[PDB]
């Protein structure tokens, strides 16, 4: 069940530690471009609650990552090079109580009506291991996991939303975690018990800061020619 | 019966167009 | 403002700010990057002044 | 003559110093890495991350005198003064004649199979002589050098998987006139020459990111003291100015700011997460007014 | 070791040159001088300086 989605403009985060106050900042960093294709991914993926298919999508230079799924049927993140105890890959399990982040040679073995179970019972020669909150817990749940310079840094932001798919405002995302994990993590598979992938790309971007240090708007600078004027001129308006 | 004693005129054009070193305290005064 | 933007630019240097090069340099190499960084701010203002 | 004329500049200097780092009481496992009874291979070069401790470099000259400690983005001496985002420790040993090759920008067969440092590279390399722990006649079984690699490593890579090299132009399954076989592990005899003999190498990997994380150097922190000319240290941001209580509304996440010029306009306490404003302190220029020399020597 | 801006026991220890230096480092092998089945008593090294 996969369909573009064209009409995206979201996946703005804050790229730095930085405080701004009523500035327009110009940056690079890696980011989803501004009608860029978002791949949608369709209840429990492309299998039905019996079947299982998943697509082990690449990871070009950081995904984008959405799902408004008020089930919970999403807990987390496989990311790695080929996922079958061969090599070193990256583990984001989301427990409601807890979330787990591991690194191992972890082996993929079919881990997932409305049954549970356990995954992962292979996971020889694990090196990290860190805790944290719950990433997930009606909300869209936003998320961009970038991996760059060993860091596999991990943003994201919860949105509440009822009568409508993605909401009408902008909204940027803050980062959640930092980890050094140090994994190469080329592909990447959705660990499933209405998502939406989109791929970063170096961009430059205007980015709008309030009053306080919250960014309320943005300009991708390559999308079209107002939005390029507007980026050489550092203004919204034109 | 203004302060600075300006003309309708003059007020309006010092209205129009717009001694701390708050901003560019990098030795530019 | 374009002559306070000059002040970030790193003209070469490992670093844009004196008191980075001073704190985790010793003196002959700070030497170094002090003068690119010297050279930049002194190539600034005499480009404002004119 | 007669007039006014601008002279020197004035500045009001700051009154004392303040140094803020947080309160971490754990020590950074540098002897454990430089001490450890069994080190990894230059091959499989062990990479052992050093984080959330103190960076009291002391421990190293304790630790042996040193042949090399050759530091590239840093001088050796203030080490101590500095915090770190992620200090990573390459352990290995190495051959004598290969140990002035470990440094960026090299080309040779070390730094092509096994071991590469950035070009831009900020750290320091570190080595000694080691024949006195790991030299035996029987010979140890420590070593293991690629002795002819497929491609050039990139900066940090490290291709533990062994595969046979081809030779020659044919696919080779362990024939010795077309397969090249990719390891030279070696045992080693105390009555080798220096150029044979080991050295044991870690290179200390630093990021000086404006410290976002700790890994800070053995300093005493002071009070915190607001509204005066000082000159302060914040988790290693260096400068001079007066600390004001601030009325930003930082998220959780910012730890400085800076104003529209990029400069420092703001920081985050080290240790009790108060957000400060850093205001520069008075300075401007004097101007001299002057009577004239033959009229009076009173000046303005 | 015996060169300018150098680190290292014995440029810390007993002999430093300055940074800004004008000069000549002049040296060779001296085997055939001082070299004795008994040994010397002519070296004497710092082995550490406080
Ligand atoms: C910025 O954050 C403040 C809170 O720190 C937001 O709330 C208002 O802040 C102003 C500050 O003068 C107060 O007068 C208002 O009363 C606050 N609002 C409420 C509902 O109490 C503020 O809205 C945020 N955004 C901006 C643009 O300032
Ligand atoms: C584009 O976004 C709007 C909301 O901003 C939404 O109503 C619309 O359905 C989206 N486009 C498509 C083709 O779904
Ligand atoms: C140091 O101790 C104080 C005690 O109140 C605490 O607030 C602070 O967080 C501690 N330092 C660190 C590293 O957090
Ligand atoms: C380091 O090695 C020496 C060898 O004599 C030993 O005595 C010492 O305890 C060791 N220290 C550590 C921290 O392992
Ligand atoms: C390599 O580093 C790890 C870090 O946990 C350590 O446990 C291991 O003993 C080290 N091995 C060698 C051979 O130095």
Redesign the pocket.
């Known amino acids: 069940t996969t369909q573009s989605?064209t009409?995206f403009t979201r996946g703005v985060y804050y790229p730095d530690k930085v405080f701004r106050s009523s500035v327009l900042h110009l940056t690079q960093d890696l980011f989803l471009p501004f009608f860029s294709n978002v791949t949608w991914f369709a209840i429990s993926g492309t299998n039905g609650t019996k079947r299982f298919d998943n697509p082990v999508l690449p990871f070009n230079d950081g995904v984008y990552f959405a799902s408004t799924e008020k089930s919970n049927i999403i807990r987390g993140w496989i990311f790695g090079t080929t996922l079958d105890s061969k090599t070193q890959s990256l583990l984001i399990v989301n427990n409601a109580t807890n979330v787990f982040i591991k690194v191992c040679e972890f082996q993929f073995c079919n881990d997932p009506m409305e049954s549970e179970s356990g995954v992962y019972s292979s996971a020889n020669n694990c090196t990290f291991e860190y805790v944290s909150q719950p990433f997930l817990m009606k909300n869209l749940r936003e998320f961009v996991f970038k991996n760059i310079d060993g860091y596999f840094k991990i943003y994201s932001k919860h949105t509440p939303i009822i009568g409508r798919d993605?909401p009408?405002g902008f909204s940027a995302l803050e980062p959640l975690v930092d980890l050094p994990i140090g994994i190469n993590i080329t592909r990447f598979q959705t660990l499933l018990a209405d998502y939406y992938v989109g791929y970063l790309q170096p961009r430059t971007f205007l980015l709008k800061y309030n009053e306080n240090g919250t960014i309320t708007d943005a300009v991708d600078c390559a999308l079209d020619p107002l939005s390029e004027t507007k980026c050489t001129l550092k203004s919204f308006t034109v | 019966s203004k302060p600075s004693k300006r003309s309708p005129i003059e007020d309006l054009l010092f209205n129009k167009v717009t001694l701390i070193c708050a901003q560019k305290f990098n030795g530019l005064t | 403002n374009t002559l306070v933007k000059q002040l970030s630019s790193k003209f070469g240097a490992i670093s844009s700010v004196l008191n980075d090069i001073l704190s985790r340099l010793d003196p002959p190499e700070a030497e170094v990057q002090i003068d690119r960084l010297i050279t930049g701010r002194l190539q600034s203002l005499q480009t404002y002044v004119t | 003559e007669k007039g006014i004329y601008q002279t020197s500049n004035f500045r009001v200097q700051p009154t004392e110093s303040i140094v803020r780092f947080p309160n971490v009481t754990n020590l950074c496992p540098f002897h454990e890495v430089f001490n450890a009874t069994r080190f990894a291979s230059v091959y499989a070069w062990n990479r052992t991350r050093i984080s959330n401790c103190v960076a009291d470099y002391s421990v190293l000259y304790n630790f042996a005198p040193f042949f090399a400690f050759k530091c590239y983005g840093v001088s050796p001496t203030k080490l101590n003064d500095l915090c770190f985002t992620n200090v990573y420790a390459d352990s290995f040993v190495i051959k004598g004649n290969e140990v002035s090759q470990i440094a960026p920008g090299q080309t040779g067969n070390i730094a092509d199979y096994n071991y590469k440092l950035p070009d831009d590279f900020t750290g320091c390399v570190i080595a000694w002589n080691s024949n006195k722990l790991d030299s035996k006649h029987s010979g140890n079984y420590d070593y293991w050098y690629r002795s002819l690699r497929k491609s050039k490593l990139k900066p940090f890579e490290r291709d533990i998987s062994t595969e046979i090299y081809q030779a020659g132009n044919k696919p080779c399954k362990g024939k010795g006139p077309n397969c090249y076989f990719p390891l030279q592990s070696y045992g080693f005899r105390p009555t080798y020459g220096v150029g044979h003999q080991p050295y044991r190498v870690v290179v200390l990997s630093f990021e000086l990111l404006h410290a976002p994380a700790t890994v800070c150097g053995p300093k005493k922190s002071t009070n915190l003291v607001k509204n005066k000319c000082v000159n302060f240290n914040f988790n290693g941001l260096t400068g001079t100015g007066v600390l004001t209580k601030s009325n930003k509304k930082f998220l959780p996440f910012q730890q400085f700011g800076r104003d529209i010029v990029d400069t420092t306009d703001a920081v985050r306490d080290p240790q009790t997460l108060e957000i400060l404003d850093i205001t520069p302190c008075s300075f401007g220029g004097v101007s001299v007014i002057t009577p004239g020399t033959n009229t009076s020597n009173q000046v303005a």
């Open positions: 989605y009409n993605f009408q």
